[PDB]
Design a protein around this ligand. Structure first.
Ligand code: GTP
Ligand code: MG
Ligand code: MG
Ligand code: MG
Ligand code: MG
Ligand code: MG
Ligand code: MG
Lengths: 344, 104, 99
RNA sequence: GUAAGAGCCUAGCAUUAGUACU
RNA sequence: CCGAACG
RNA sequence: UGCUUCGGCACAACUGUUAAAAUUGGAAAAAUACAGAGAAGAUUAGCAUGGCCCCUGCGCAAGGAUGACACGCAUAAAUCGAGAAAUGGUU
């Protein structure tokens, strides 16, 4: 219609925020010797893996936070981690240009996916095919046969580092976000972008799918946008700006969107209304700089009740819902609908 | 300043690392968190169970020879050292111990 | 392992269905229900003096296991029916009595 | 003193298509 | 035990 | 060659990148002569980066002067408006 017309529609009909209980940080785990950069939860929900700038992958007990195992095989930072839901496999990528399949029955690297020309930044397992997708500084999403280690496909078109990656079973089966400020939705059968989304002004460092809805969120240093699938229809911006580079985004089944800032902020938003009900800043562990405070990864556990964050003060932090909270004792940041008339 | 971009008869040069290996995939069986096995359970029950177990079962509750000597009691007052993580490159304890060990 | 392999717990691996015999199930069910056609016998001897093999010859004459025998003389070993535990097997020794 | 290349002359690898008259 | 290339 | 009513049937079925050539062109090398080596004073170890540069190598090694090149020599005008003053037209 217009920006004015749509702004009046928006003042009338914006979905109100669903009340979400606040989250509190209940656990710091020290022990990585570099920035914790990636997290991944195992589908059983009993351990998580964190990769680091100290080049290791640590396996942690999800309920005690206990170091179960350290895995060394990367030469540089571990930048991405993906635990398979269908295979007893963990996948890691790293700044060493290397993608590794870890056999979790051996605790050993059994396959290596060779071919990234620069450091690898993002990883994604196809949820239904035995295929993995990695993006890196060579601006390219490399699509790998899990079994034969073969590079089945190269998704070309981005211009800078592919920083975020999504994989789903419906079309578009790969979503990438890049430092070139675009999101490509890919047709995995054709090897071609099915859509290029140019609404972001900064680089898209975080993508997240909605667990249940056909929609994803992308996050920049400037906005978190929400997009409808298959075609990547812009739904909306979050109703506030985390004034931070967002490194990580996780979405819950309750629709809690967690976004984690390069400055160590953690904002919790209502998916579906776009409204942030919580805003936190990290505390950095003793010794750290407060410059060294970013929030590089976050995942929810499989139930959605825990959020594990991988931080630049080299900690894993764990957050649980203060779910003994009720919309009366704990509403959080309160909502004013987007009443403005603005230009879009 | 700018990396190489990595876009994609076939060449018949065969690498050694590209010879067949691990030619079948392991799948998660019944007992290794397989997807059909995991819909069946309440993972929140097991998580809150394990967290309560950990958090409670870590809490554990439901004149002499030394008369000319000029200094007495000089160890008393010394700090007993602690298992702590300092996020400092050079001011952590591994490093202080390392430099103590290797520099004489 | 971080994902424990779901292992065949190789203790003593038997076969997955009652085998073919020269009699039925109900025939033995009959011959059991009357004391005057049942003899209980333990077989004993020295070490190796032929006990396991005699029991095996009985099995060989009253059952259906010929291609088993072909697998035995192709693999190069003679059968040991009552020596079932594959660790009592690989010592050519009966370790625990079996009925 | 490396040893690189530019060129000059002379300098033996690949190819099987094409040749008309108001 | 045991030898070749390269730098 | 069988079978043959000796008339004939049956069977068997399309090689050749067609050259002992003809051109035809492009090539590495050799000599010659040219000229003849990173970094900041000098002398020197390298490891990179980028790609219509390759060579040696089985190479996802390693090497080739850190293999070379590039590498800036920025005669890359990165360039212009503010105001007073003063002078010019017109009344
Ligand atoms: N020459 C000969 N050897 C035999 C005969 N029967 C069995 N054997 C051999 O004797 C070996 C030992 O006999 P087993 O079948 O082990 O009988 P066993 O005496 O119960 O031995 P244990 O199992 O140790 O008690 C076998 O492996 C055969 O090679 C036979 O009639 N003649
Ligand atoms: Mg070297
Ligand atoms: Mg050298
Ligand atoms: Mg080098
Ligand atoms: Mg080299
Ligand atoms: Mg040298
Ligand atoms: Mg070089």
């Amino acid at each position: 219609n217009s920006s004015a017309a749509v702004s009046r529609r928006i003042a009338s009909k914006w979905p109100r925020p669903v009340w979400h209980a606040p989250w509190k940080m209940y656990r710091v785990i020290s022990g990585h010797l570099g920035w914790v950069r990636c997290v991944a939860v195992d589908p059983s929900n009993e351990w998580f893996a964190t990769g680091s700038a100290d080049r290791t992958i640590k396996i942690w007990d999800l309920a005690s936070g206990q170091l179960k195992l350290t895995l060394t095989g990367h030469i540089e930072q571990v930048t991405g981690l993906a635990v398979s839901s269908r295979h007893p496999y963990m996948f890691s990528c790293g700044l060493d240009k290397m993608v590794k399949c870890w056999d979790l029955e051996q605790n050993k690297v059994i396959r290596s996916y060779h071919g990234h020309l620069s450091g690898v930044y993002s990883i994604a397992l196809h949820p239904n095919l035995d295929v993995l997708m990695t993006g890196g500084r060579d601006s390219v999403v490399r699509v790998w046969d899990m079994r034969t280690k073969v590079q089945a496909m190269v998704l070309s078109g981005h211009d800078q580092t592919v920083c975020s990656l999504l994989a789903q079973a419906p079309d578009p089966q790969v979503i990438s976000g890049s430092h070139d400020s675009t999101i490509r939705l890919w047709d995995l059968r054709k090897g071609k972008a099915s859509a290029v989304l140019t609404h972001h002004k900064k680089s898209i460092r975080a993508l997240a799918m909605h667990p249940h809805e056909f929609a994803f969120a992308s996050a920049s240093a400037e906005n978190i946008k929400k997009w409808a699938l298959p075609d990547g229809d812009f739904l909306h911006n979050m109703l506030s700006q985390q004034r931070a580079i967002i490194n990580s985004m996780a979405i819950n089944q309750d629709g809690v969107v967690a976004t984690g800032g390069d400055n160590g902020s953690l904002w919790l938003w209502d998916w579906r209304s776009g409204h942030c009900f919580q805003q936190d800043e990290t505390v950095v562990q003793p010794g750290s700089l407060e410059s060294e405070g970013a929030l590089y990864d976050m995942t929810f556990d499989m139930t959605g009740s825990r959020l594990i964050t991988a931080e630049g003060d080299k900690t894993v932090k764990m957050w649980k819902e203060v779910e003994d909270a009720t919309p009366e004792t704990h509403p959080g940041l309160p909502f004013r609908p987007p009443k403005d008339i603005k230009r879009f | 300043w700018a990396p190489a971009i990595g876009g994609e008869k076939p060449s018949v040069q065969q690498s050694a690392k590209n010879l067949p290996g691990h030619t079948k995939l392991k799948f998660r069986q019944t007992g290794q968190a397989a997807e059909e096995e995991l819909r069946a359970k309440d993972l929140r029950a097991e998580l809150e169970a394990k967290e309560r177990k950990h958090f409670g079962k870590q809490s554990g509750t439901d004149r002499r020879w030394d008369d000319d000597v000029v200094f007495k009691n000089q160890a008393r007052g010394e700090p007993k050292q602690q298992k702590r993580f300092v996020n400092d490159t050079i001011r952590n304890d591994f490093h202080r111990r390392f430099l103590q060990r290797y520099i004489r | 392992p971080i994902v424990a392999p779901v292992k065949v717990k190789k203790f003593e691996t038997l076969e997955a269905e009652p085998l073919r015999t020269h009699y039925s199930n109900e025939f033995l069910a009959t011959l059991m229900a009357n004391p005057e056609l049942v003899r209980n016998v333990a077989v004993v001897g020295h070490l190796h003096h032929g006990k396991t093999t005699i029991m095996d010859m009985f099995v060989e004459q009253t059952h259906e296991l010929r291609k088993m025998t072909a697998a035995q003389q192709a693999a190069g070993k003679q059968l040991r029916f009552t020596d079932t535990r594959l660790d009592e097997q690989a010592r050519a020794m009966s370790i625990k009595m079996m009925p």
